[PDB]
Amino acid sequence: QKSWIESTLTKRECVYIIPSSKDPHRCLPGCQICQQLVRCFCGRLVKQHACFTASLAMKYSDVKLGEHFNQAIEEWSVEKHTEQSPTDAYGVINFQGGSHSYRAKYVRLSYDTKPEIILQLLLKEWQMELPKLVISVHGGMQKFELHPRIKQLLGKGLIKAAVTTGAWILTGGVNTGVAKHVGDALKEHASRSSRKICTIGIAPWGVIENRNDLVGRDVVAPYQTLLNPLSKLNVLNNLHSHFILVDDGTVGKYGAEVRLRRELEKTINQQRIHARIGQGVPVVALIFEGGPNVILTVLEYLQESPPVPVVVCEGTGRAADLLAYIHKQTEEGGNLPDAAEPDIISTIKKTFNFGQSEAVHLFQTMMECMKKKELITVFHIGSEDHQDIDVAILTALLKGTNASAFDQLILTLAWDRVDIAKNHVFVYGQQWLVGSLEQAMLDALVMDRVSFVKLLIENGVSMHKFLTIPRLEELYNTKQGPTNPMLFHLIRDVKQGNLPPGYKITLIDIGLVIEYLMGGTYRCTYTRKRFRLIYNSLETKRFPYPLNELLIWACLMKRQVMARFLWQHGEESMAKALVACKIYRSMAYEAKQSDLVDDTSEELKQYSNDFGQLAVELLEQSFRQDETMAMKLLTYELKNWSNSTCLKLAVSSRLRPFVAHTCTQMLLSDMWMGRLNMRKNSWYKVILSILVPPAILMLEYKTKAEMSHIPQSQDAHQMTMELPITRKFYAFYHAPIVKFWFNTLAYLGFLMLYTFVVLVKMEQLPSVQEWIVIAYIFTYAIEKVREVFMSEAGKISQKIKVWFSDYFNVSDTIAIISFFVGFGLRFGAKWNYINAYDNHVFVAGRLIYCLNIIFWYVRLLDFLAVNQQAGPYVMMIGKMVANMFYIVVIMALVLLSFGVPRKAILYPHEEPSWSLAKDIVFHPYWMIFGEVYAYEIDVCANDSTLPTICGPGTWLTPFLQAVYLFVQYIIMVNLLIAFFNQVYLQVKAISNIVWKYQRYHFIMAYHEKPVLPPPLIILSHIVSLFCCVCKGPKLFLTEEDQKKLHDFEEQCVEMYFDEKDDKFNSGSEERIRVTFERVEQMSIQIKEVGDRVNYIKRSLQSLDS
Amino acid sequence: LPITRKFYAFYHAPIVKFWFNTLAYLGFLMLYTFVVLVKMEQLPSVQEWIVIAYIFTYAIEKVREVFMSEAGKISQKIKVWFSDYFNVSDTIAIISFFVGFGLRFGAKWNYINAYDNHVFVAGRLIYCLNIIFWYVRLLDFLAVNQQAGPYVMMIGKMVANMFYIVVI
Amino acid sequence: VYLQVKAISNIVWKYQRYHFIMAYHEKPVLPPPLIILSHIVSLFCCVCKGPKLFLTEEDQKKLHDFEEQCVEMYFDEKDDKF
Amino acid sequence: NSGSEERIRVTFERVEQMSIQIKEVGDRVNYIKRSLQSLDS
Ligand SMILES: CCCCCCCC/C=C/CCCCCCCC(=O)O[C@@H](COC(=O)CCCCCCCCCCCCCCC)COP(=O)([O-])OCC[N+](C)(C)C
Ligand SMILES: CCCCCCCC/C=C/CCCCCCCC(=O)O[C@@H](COC(=O)CCCCCCCCCCCCCCC)COP(=O)([O-])OCC[N+](C)(C)C
Ligand SMILES: CCCCCCCC/C=C/CCCCCCCC(=O)O[C@@H](COC(=O)CCCCCCCCCCCCCCC)COP(=O)([O-])OCC[N+](C)(C)C
Ligand SMILES: CCCCCCCC/C=C\CCCCCCCC(=O)O[C@@H](COC(=O)CCCCCCCCCCCCCCC)COP(=O)([O-])OCC[N+](C)(C)C
Ligand SMILES: CCCCCCCC/C=C\CCCCCCCC(=O)O[C@@H](COC(=O)CCCCCCCCCCCCCCC)COP(=O)([O-])OCC[N+](C)(C)C
Ligand SMILES: CCCCCCCC/C=C\CCCCCCCC(=O)O[C@@H](COC(=O)CCCCCCCCCCCCCCC)COP(=O)([O-])OCC[N+](C)(C)C
Ligand SMILES: CCCCCCCC/C=C\CCCCCCCC(=O)O[C@@H](COC(=O)CCCCCCCCCCCCCCC)COP(=O)([O-])OCC[N+](C)(C)C
Ligand SMILES: CCCCCCCC/C=C\CCCCCCCC(=O)O[C@@H](COC(=O)CCCCCCCCCCCCCCC)COP(=O)([O-])OCC[N+](C)(C)C
Ligand SMILES: CCCCCCCC/C=C\CCCCCCCC(=O)O[C@@H](COC(=O)CCCCCCCCCCCCCCC)COP(=O)([O-])OCC[N+](C)(C)C
Ligand SMILES: CCCCCCCC/C=C\CCCCCCCC(=O)O[C@@H](COC(=O)CCCCCCCCCCCCCCC)COP(=O)([O-])OCC[N+](C)(C)C
Ligand SMILES: CCCCCCCC/C=C\CCCCCCCC(=O)O[C@@H](COC(=O)CCCCCCCCCCCCCCC)COP(=O)([O-])OCC[N+](C)(C)C
Ligand SMILES: CCCCCCCC/C=C\CCCCCCCC(=O)O[C@@H](COC(=O)CCCCCCCCCCCCCCC)COP(=O)([O-])OCC[N+](C)(C)C
């Protein structure tokens, strides 16, 4: 039946008839009134049962004999006469009301339903997730009433306490009592608002009026919400979400749940509270207006299986408030003022008519309650003690169970209540044995609760002695808490795509993940030789810089709020932020690449750009203090980060606001010059000094002091250590600015010669010009091979895919390959000697050169793209050409729309021919450029140049061409121009940042090239080869300076953090909504005082009364 | 996932029916371009028959998607379909083709010169103008792409609303 | 015109995908020269003798549950921001 | 002097002396009422 409720759980049927209150009366013949009102000790009529076996008494007489000795009549028991016979009330209520529906669920069941299946109904069947708190509400069972202040404050606190701990409120489920007032408070407070306070009412079935409506299988239970006061029995309060209804087998009887309700709570405080945490779910109990049984059940908690605290509030009603009285006037041991029982027994007889000897018993038991007042909690709502019932509720479960302060934190940690922990658990004079703090931190980190981590870090914890290898290895490999599906995929690939089905994660295999995420030739400290051994082998396992290893964790597991927090702590702030940007950015790519079950990449994209801006804002700060030191920060080896550099890391992430920041730019300019002081020299003096070397010794060079911030080579460092002449030439020819204008001049002289060769005739053998051309291209090629093999990546297949990912490197490959095809044909041809251009192998060779040369003119746009003013226009041209594809397809369609009808009308006797392919494109294309072929349009006109193709239909071709040019020349060309106009505006908006970012790869290229240009470069290769066969820039800082840099780090690391808060406090509209927050305490307190001012003035005249 | 079910999954996907009609339509224009550019003898060539077959069945295809439309009133199945630019153009392109075929085919061939019989010429010249309809129908295939379609929308709005500048 | 269309071009393209895609959900699987066989077979079928989301009741039920849950969460939200 | 948002942040400056002094008076109003019953004690 797929209805586990129907199957395992069951109802109760009165299957026997025992006349109750059988008092024969009106309407003289017996049977009629013996058939009118003969109730049973079950509670129903014999005619209201009928029950397929109780109908057998409607017809004859009550299911028994006649008189049927009254020694035997009394003997009902649901144990004896009641058959179970599955439930018929497992529907769902649709409580009608406000602009919503207050939907809720229910079930019928017996008072002896097992405590485990009722759990297997709440959690398994109803999907309801196990709580971290229960609020067992035990107050008034009649329609009690309260005043406005308590109506709001008590409401918020009870609600909020359930919000924080995801609690399960428990009531009777009946809107005569607590449930009415419990449920109400949820209504106004908007607890529903993107939120649920799980709320349950254990009621009995028989009473709830319109129970017969709820009868039936799974249905939208049309509970009618009639507030008709004729139905005393009850109206189910329409806010409680769930209604377990004890079908004990009685109707009109009461108290079917009193044990079950408790047993459910007993087997709610008997399961774990999030397995990382080991504790039973704590259970508070509250008291509203309340009766003499409501105080009685307080004695069923204080002296009960694991002691259940009590949160009697102050000011509610008769019970909840009176228990404050006996609390207040009586000592910690419940020591009464001896005239208490001589004047409280008036209070009982004042509040109740419970009696006198009865009342004596009440206070006596009520002190038997108050024998232990370390465990109850009077919420003094007047005088504002705990300032919401909440803080008293939660505190009440952290005091009176002889629990340890670790056992007190660990619960607060589970609840998301730091405020409870900092204010109560972290109280003056506390014990905290040895690793309690440490065990909480392994719990707080895996559970992703920064606010407790933050607190613990302030309250004695140190990450230095707490990051051991088993521990942090644990902290990686936990699916408890916010879990990443991506890391398990990342470990898959690096582990050959082979998982042991269990596969505990090591620190080692993670190191290969980072080396894949950071890319290039990064080497994590988890894959090194020393670490890899001591790991297997395993005091020394305390990780010299732990806050570096946790920042990796928080980012590999998408725990941003932990990452961003931990980043604040420790040192190497700017570096950690540029790694994080790289880690997230790569995972944000591998999501979009792997494209599996995984998702959530734009979330990672945002996380990278979050840390990216942090590194930029630290650069700003550090640069506004000392420009020179900031440059040194961009270039010191890190040594915890694979001996990399903060700049190098930011280029890997393509983090442009950092590379386009004026600090890097001023440094990029200083590496461009080398030891040349170009603020004093000029680029025309560099060109002159290349062509006239003696001017090299006339230029203004630099010292060591104004070169100390610049990353230098081993040589450029050393040659300055030990300003003579030979060192003045070494400074010039090794500067990147010189290697540019020395390759540029050779390249321009290359094109001048190569232009001369294609324009001047070729005899059999090459001329000196053509040999010098071939020499350039040959060595230029070797130069390009080297800068692939000597790239930065390590995998040759990735050294390759990056280099071929640039336009001008692809073009050079084609230009170099196409040249030697041409040389091979030009040179390997058998010369004719009657005419050069009769041998078609020689011609093909020459014609490849004359097209080859176009590649080499266009390579000059790459030299021009170096200039700040020209480069934006080279970017445009590429974006224009790349993205105009679809306009040009339309243009080619419009073209054939015209070219095919024209050729068909004008040339109607054409066999198939290759000319037909030319003649449908040729003239229509030159029209695009405004050539209308004026004397060819009308071919039958007297001034025609085509008088012979006059014939039938040819008069159609002017009309065709008139339409064509309007569409082509006016619409389509200016649509393309309109596109290009928007490209222009887009590029100019971004052109300067992109130019600044591309200076890096540019300048670093001309820091690695040889000092000789491509014809003479071969000597530099030779010398730089037989060196290696026989046998880059680093900021060299002495320890005295290396020290002060770290001092300049921390000082600027510091001043940044302080600043952000200070500006952020001020705000603009923040301040206005901080005002509005303050508009309440005024209005409340202008009503506080304004409430008393009427209380003041009544006094004054009463004192003069 | 057996074999016959793997073919049923492919040829019944909309992406396949697009790139299968698109390739036939492009092969249609390649042939129909070949027919107008190459001379016509008395009877059609295999190329021209394959052209006529396309256009004939292409028409029946358009009849069906009117009668098998979503509306119920035939007079509203009609006014909606003719409310699209390329369905109006196809109607003209289909009607104008068979006027041309009827003249091209129903003409009395001359045998001294094809282009002396003016009924044959009118037929050929309708085809050579008819073909413009079929190049322009390709803008509807291109309008499927996110990048090209905005430029087809422009051209229509440009042409529709430039009336008064062109009168001046 | 250019600037006007580009401001609205992406919404209109997205709206026109519907009639486009639904067209090529109803067409025959054979293209217009060979389509005649598809007409013939799809005619003598009718002479002799569209897309629906088929949900089993177990799933059809949970959809209505996904309705109301999201129907609910919407109404609560609007007020709270407002 | 007049300003536009200046005035709003001159208000916010004044939101404190009110809140302090609404707590000044509001501190005493509890000190007042305890008196009255203590004078009638
Ligand atoms: C990752 C790297 C990035 C950078 C890219 C770098 C890679 C660049 C890659 C470049 C590849 C270039 C390929 C050239 C192929 C030539 C084909 C050809 O047409 O041959 C012709 C000559 O063939 C001969 O062998 C005779 C000519 C002398 C050799 C000159 C070509 C080799 C130079 C190579 C220098 C390599 C340069 C690179 C050096 C490093 C064949 O025709 P024929 O014999 O004339 O015809 C005879 C007919 N007849 C008898 C009727 C007359
Ligand atoms: C605005 C200025 C225009 C005035 C407006 C009024 C329209 C005036 C039009 C009037 C139509 C009558 C003129 C043609 C009569 C035959 C004469 C002739 O020699 O024709 C020649 C061609 O042309 C033709 O054979 C037909 C041309 C029709 C074009 C008109 C289209 C509608 C114009 C808009 C309608 C207007 C209203 C709507 C506007 C919104 C014959 O051939 P051929 O080219 O010499 O050469 C071929 C070979 N041959 C030499 C061996 C023969
Ligand atoms: C809601 C719908 C949306 C979709 C739109 C769909 C609707 C599309 C509607 C299309 C309507 C097309 C109308 C064609 C009229 C031809 C007129 C003509 O010029 O005839 C000529 C031939 O006439 C003949 O009868 C002989 C040629 C054979 C018949 C070919 C045309 C019929 C094909 C129809 C296929 C219909 C296709 C549609 C099928 C579904 C008359 O001239 P002649 O005899 O050559 O001259 C003799 C002179 N001489 C003796 C001196 C030489
Ligand atoms: C690779 C590009 C780099 C930039 C440009 C480099 C070169 C710039 C330098 C000069 C450009 C011009 C070259 C000389 C042309 C000589 C002309 C000739 O054929 O014979 C002549 C003399 O010839 C000699 O005296 C032979 C010279 C030996 C080779 C010199 C190589 C030096 C450059 C090695 C490279 C390293 C240096 C650069 C390092 C940065 C006589 O003249 P002609 O014949 O009556 O006149 C020619 C006209 N004709 C064709 C119609 C007949
Ligand atoms: C002797 C003379 C005889 C020989 C003459 C030979 C003729 C000359 C032949 C060719 C021109 C010479 C240069 C090659 C073209 C540039 C490649 C390119 O775009 O690279 C770039 C992208 O790369 C890609 O996107 C890869 C796929 C290519 C894209 C499609 C266009 C090019 C294909 C061929 C179409 C034309 C057919 C030509 C091919 C047969 C890498 O550069 P980037 O800086 O990263 O910018 C890219 C940015 N983007 C990816 C976002 C867009
Ligand atoms: C990637 C590498 C690609 C290319 C590799 C190498 C390919 C090797 C290619 C060619 C080598 C073949 C040598 C000759 C073969 C026999 C023919 C012969 O000798 O003569 C014939 C030559 O006929 C021709 O067509 C010559 C031109 C062919 C080359 C076309 C360009 C290819 C490169 C494209 C650029 C690629 C750029 C790619 C860049 C990435 C005729 O000449 P004849 O004998 O004087 O005439 C006799 C007849 N007569 C009596 C009427 C006069
Ligand atoms: C034989 C004729 C050859 C000359 C051509 C004459 C025509 C006019 C030519 C060129 C004007 C540009 C030259 C002066 C630029 C100096 C400043 C500059 O822009 O610096 C840039 C570098 O320099 C470049 O990027 C310039 C590129 C040089 C190659 C030119 C090839 C194209 C011209 C070939 C002819 C093709 C057209 C057809 C005409 C025949 C920026 O670098 P930087 O490190 O920032 O610079 C210093 C630091 N600072 C600027 C920050 C302070
Ligand atoms: C002899 C004849 C005369 C010679 C002409 C003169 C030589 C030609 C002149 C200029 C050549 C192009 C300059 C490149 C500038 C750099 C661009 C670049 O780096 O990336 C661009 C791609 O790059 C491309 O798309 C390359 C262009 C394709 C090949 C050019 C064909 C030219 C003819 C075709 C026209 C004919 C069609 C109709 C003809 C019937 C970037 O594009 P993006 O993706 O939008 O941006 C990403 C940014 N990124 C750079 C960071 C990656
Ligand atoms: C409807 C459009 C759809 C797309 C394209 C479809 C067709 C693409 C297929 C091919 C394109 C070319 C067509 C054949 C041309 C033959 C040439 C000829 O006249 O005789 C020849 C052989 O001819 C035969 O053997 C007759 C073939 C019978 C008809 C075949 C129909 C198949 C397509 C049915 C449709 C369903 C398939 C597609 C389903 C998606 C010999 O050649 P020739 O005569 O020496 O040279 C001709 C040039 N001339 C005129 C100058 C002489
Ligand atoms: C073999 C060759 C020989 C024969 C050659 C024959 C020549 C070729 C003849 C014509 C071109 C072929 C296609 C027809 C034109 C498109 C119609 C149209 O605009 O439809 C659209 C509107 O429809 C209307 O608005 C209805 C009234 C027409 C508006 C005025 C312009 C067209 C009139 C005729 C003027 C030209 C005179 C030509 C007519 C005699 C429906 O499409 P839509 O997607 O809803 O877009 C509309 C949006 N709008 C309404 C807001 C704007
Ligand atoms: C909606 C339906 C519209 C059309 C329906 C069908 C209309 C039926 C139309 C024509 C059928 C008429 C058949 C021939 C009649 C007698 C004349 C004759 O035989 O020869 C004459 C033909 O003279 C011409 O002008 C022929 C061309 C007329 C058609 C013009 C296009 C109409 C369609 C527009 C497109 C519509 C697109 C609309 C799409 C929505 C002369 O030729 P000859 O005999 O060789 O010469 C003898 C003289 N000689 C000795 C000097 C050589
Ligand atoms: C052989 C000759 C060469 C062939 C040329 C190439 C073929 C021709 C090329 C392009 C053709 C048009 C592309 C249509 C694109 C779709 C547009 C569309 O759907 O609706 C548009 C209407 O549509 C029109 O107005 C249609 C254009 C009128 C007919 C074209 C005449 C061309 C010549 C005239 C010039 C000559 C004048 C002067 C001459 C002396 C929408 O317009 P809207 O109301 O603003 O927008 C509503 C939006 N809606 C779509 C949702 C409804």
GROMACS .gro file of C-alpha atoms in nm, chain A residues 56-241:
model
  186
   56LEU     CA    1  -2.485  -0.568   1.647
   57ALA     CA    2  -2.609  -0.384   1.960
   58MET     CA    3  -2.802  -0.105   1.788
   59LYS     CA    4  -3.029  -0.381   1.655
   60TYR     CA    5  -3.062  -0.598   1.969
   61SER     CA    6  -2.931  -0.420   2.281
   62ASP     CA    7  -2.593  -0.301   2.416
   63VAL     CA    8  -2.315  -0.553   2.337
   64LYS     CA    9  -2.383  -0.756   2.651
   65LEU     CA   10  -2.680  -0.926   2.818
   66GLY     CA   11  -2.962  -0.721   2.973
   67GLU     CA   12  -2.899  -0.615   3.335
   68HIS     CA   13  -2.564  -0.795   3.299
   69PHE     CA   14  -2.424  -0.769   3.656
   70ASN     CA   15  -2.277  -0.430   3.750
   71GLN     CA   16  -1.998  -0.635   3.908
   72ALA     CA   17  -1.900  -0.682   3.539
   73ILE     CA   18  -2.025  -0.362   3.367
   74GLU     CA   19  -1.740  -0.138   3.490
   75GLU     CA   20  -1.475  -0.362   3.334
   76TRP     CA   21  -1.382  -0.168   3.023
   77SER     CA   22  -1.025  -0.125   2.932
   78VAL     CA   23  -0.874  -0.025   2.599
   79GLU     CA   24  -0.646  -0.319   2.676
   80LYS     CA   25  -0.958  -0.541   2.689
   81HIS     CA   26  -1.211  -0.409   2.435
   82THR     CA   27  -1.038  -0.214   2.160
   83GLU     CA   28  -0.923  -0.342   1.819
   84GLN     CA   29  -0.651  -0.162   1.629
   85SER     CA   30  -0.741  -0.182   1.257
   86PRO     CA   31  -0.527   0.069   1.059
   87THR     CA   32  -0.560   0.449   1.071
   88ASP     CA   33  -0.777   0.642   0.824
   89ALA     CA   34  -0.647   0.996   0.892
   90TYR     CA   35  -0.302   1.041   0.728
   91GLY     CA   36  -0.390   1.348   0.521
   92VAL     CA   37  -0.270   1.710   0.513
   93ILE     CA   38  -0.458   2.014   0.648
   94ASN     CA   39  -0.515   2.331   0.445
   95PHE     CA   40  -0.602   2.578   0.727
   96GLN     CA   41  -0.769   2.870   0.552
   97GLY     CA   42  -0.702   3.222   0.672
   98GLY     CA   43  -0.497   3.524   0.567
   99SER     CA   44  -0.326   3.575   0.230
  100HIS     CA   45  -0.174   3.227   0.261
  101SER     CA   46  -0.285   2.874   0.365
  102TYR     CA   47  -0.089   2.771   0.680
  103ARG     CA   48  -0.065   2.415   0.550
  104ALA     CA   49   0.001   2.143   0.807
  105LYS     CA   50   0.005   1.765   0.849
  106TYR     CA   51  -0.136   1.508   1.091
  107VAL     CA   52  -0.183   1.144   1.189
  108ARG     CA   53  -0.392   0.930   1.425
  109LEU     CA   54  -0.215   0.687   1.656
  110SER     CA   55  -0.235   0.506   1.988
  111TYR     CA   56  -0.100   0.613   2.327
  112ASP     CA   57   0.129   0.303   2.323
  113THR     CA   58   0.274   0.370   1.976
  114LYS     CA   59   0.642   0.280   2.008
  115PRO     CA   60   0.876   0.576   2.080
  116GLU     CA   61   1.099   0.475   1.786
  117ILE     CA   62   0.831   0.458   1.516
  118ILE     CA   63   0.693   0.800   1.612
  119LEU     CA   64   1.049   0.914   1.543
  120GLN     CA   65   1.040   0.709   1.221
  121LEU     CA   66   0.726   0.913   1.142
  122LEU     CA   67   0.867   1.258   1.222
  123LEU     CA   68   1.208   1.220   1.057
  124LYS     CA   69   1.167   0.936   0.807
  125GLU     CA   70   0.809   0.986   0.688
  126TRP     CA   71   0.758   1.360   0.742
  127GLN     CA   72   1.121   1.439   0.633
  128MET     CA   73   1.163   1.665   0.937
  129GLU     CA   74   1.532   1.710   1.016
  130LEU     CA   75   1.636   1.616   1.373
  131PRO     CA   76   1.657   1.929   1.595
  132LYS     CA   77   1.922   2.079   1.818
  133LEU     CA   78   1.667   2.207   2.070
  134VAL     CA   79   1.315   2.119   2.180
  135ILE     CA   80   1.084   2.358   2.363
  136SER     CA   81   0.836   2.142   2.556
  137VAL     CA   82   0.559   2.395   2.620
  138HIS     CA   83   0.347   2.321   2.929
  139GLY     CA   84   0.123   2.610   3.032
  140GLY     CA   85  -0.244   2.693   3.046
  141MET     CA   86  -0.484   2.440   2.898
  142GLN     CA   87  -0.770   2.694   2.884
  143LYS     CA   88  -0.809   3.021   2.693
  144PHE     CA   89  -0.579   3.241   2.901
  145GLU     CA   90  -0.493   3.598   2.801
  146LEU     CA   91  -0.193   3.830   2.837
  147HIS     CA   92  -0.105   4.202   2.800
  148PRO     CA   93   0.085   4.376   2.513
  149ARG     CA   94   0.440   4.397   2.651
  150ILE     CA   95   0.463   4.028   2.739
  151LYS     CA   96   0.273   3.951   2.417
  152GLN     CA   97   0.565   4.085   2.210
  153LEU     CA   98   0.886   4.034   2.411
  154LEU     CA   99   0.813   3.679   2.526
  155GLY     CA  100   0.700   3.606   2.171
  156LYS     CA  101   1.022   3.722   2.005
  157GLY     CA  102   1.248   3.540   2.249
  158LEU     CA  103   1.062   3.211   2.228
  159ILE     CA  104   1.054   3.244   1.849
  160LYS     CA  105   1.414   3.359   1.805
  161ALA     CA  106   1.540   3.083   2.035
  162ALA     CA  107   1.373   2.836   1.798
  163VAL     CA  108   1.509   3.015   1.490
  164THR     CA  109   1.872   2.993   1.602
  165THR     CA  110   1.872   2.630   1.718
  166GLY     CA  111   1.634   2.504   1.446
  167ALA     CA  112   1.422   2.389   1.734
  168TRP     CA  113   1.105   2.178   1.752
  169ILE     CA  114   0.838   2.343   1.965
  170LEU     CA  115   0.600   2.098   2.133
  171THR     CA  116   0.249   2.189   2.247
  172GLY     CA  117  -0.087   2.021   2.294
  173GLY     CA  118  -0.201   2.147   1.954
  174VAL     CA  119  -0.520   2.312   2.080
  175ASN     CA  120  -0.602   2.683   2.070
  176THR     CA  121  -0.738   2.684   2.424
  177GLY     CA  122  -0.406   2.728   2.602
  178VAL     CA  123  -0.039   2.765   2.516
  179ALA     CA  124  -0.092   2.654   2.156
  180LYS     CA  125  -0.309   2.957   2.082
  181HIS     CA  126  -0.044   3.189   2.220
  182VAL     CA  127   0.252   2.986   2.092
  183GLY     CA  128   0.098   2.984   1.746
  184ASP     CA  129  -0.003   3.351   1.749
  185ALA     CA  130   0.350   3.474   1.817
  186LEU     CA  131   0.468   3.296   1.501
  187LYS     CA  132   0.198   3.478   1.302
  188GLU     CA  133   0.286   3.843   1.368
  189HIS     CA  134   0.664   3.801   1.392
  190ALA     CA  135   0.679   3.665   1.035
  191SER     CA  136   0.875   3.359   1.150
  192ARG     CA  137   0.758   3.205   0.822
  193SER     CA  138   0.948   3.468   0.622
  194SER     CA  139   1.193   3.256   0.421
  195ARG     CA  140   1.204   3.047   0.737
  196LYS     CA  141   1.023   2.778   0.938
  197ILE     CA  142   1.003   2.739   1.313
  198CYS     CA  143   0.912   2.372   1.322
  199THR     CA  144   0.609   2.345   1.547
  200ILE     CA  145   0.416   2.035   1.654
  201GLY     CA  146   0.103   1.969   1.858
  202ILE     CA  147   0.051   1.637   2.034
  203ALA     CA  148  -0.328   1.635   2.084
  204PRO     CA  149  -0.586   1.357   2.123
  205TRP     CA  150  -0.799   1.257   1.824
  206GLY     CA  151  -1.140   1.210   1.982
  207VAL     CA  152  -1.185   1.567   2.096
  208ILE     CA  153  -1.079   1.781   1.801
  209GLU     CA  154  -1.403   1.910   1.656
  210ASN     CA  155  -1.457   1.807   1.294
  211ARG     CA  156  -1.230   1.507   1.353
  212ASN     CA  157  -1.476   1.322   1.129
  213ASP     CA  158  -1.373   1.566   0.854
  214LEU     CA  159  -1.004   1.475   0.883
  215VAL     CA  160  -1.107   1.106   0.855
  216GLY     CA  161  -1.015   0.951   0.520
  217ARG     CA  162  -0.695   0.854   0.342
  218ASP     CA  163  -0.434   1.103   0.213
  219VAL     CA  164  -0.637   1.413   0.132
  220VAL     CA  165  -0.623   1.789   0.144
  221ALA     CA  166  -0.792   1.776   0.487
  222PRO     CA  167  -1.051   2.057   0.457
  223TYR     CA  168  -1.024   2.167   0.818
  224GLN     CA  169  -1.286   2.437   0.818
  225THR     CA  170  -1.133   2.680   1.071
  226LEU     CA  171  -1.474   2.756   1.225
  227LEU     CA  172  -1.423   2.952   1.547
  228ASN     CA  173  -1.781   2.852   1.649
  229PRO     CA  174  -1.756   2.855   2.032
  230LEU     CA  175  -2.017   2.577   2.052
  231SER     CA  176  -1.723   2.347   1.973
  232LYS     CA  177  -1.549   2.356   2.311
  233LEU     CA  178  -1.364   2.034   2.228
  234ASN     CA  179  -1.117   2.235   2.035
  235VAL     CA  180  -1.026   2.424   1.721
  236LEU     CA  181  -0.683   2.302   1.611
  237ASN     CA  182  -0.459   2.608   1.619
  238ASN     CA  183  -0.391   2.679   1.254
  239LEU     CA  184  -0.021   2.780   1.288
  240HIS     CA  185   0.126   2.454   1.424
  241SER     CA  186   0.266   2.272   1.123
   0.00000   0.00000   0.00000
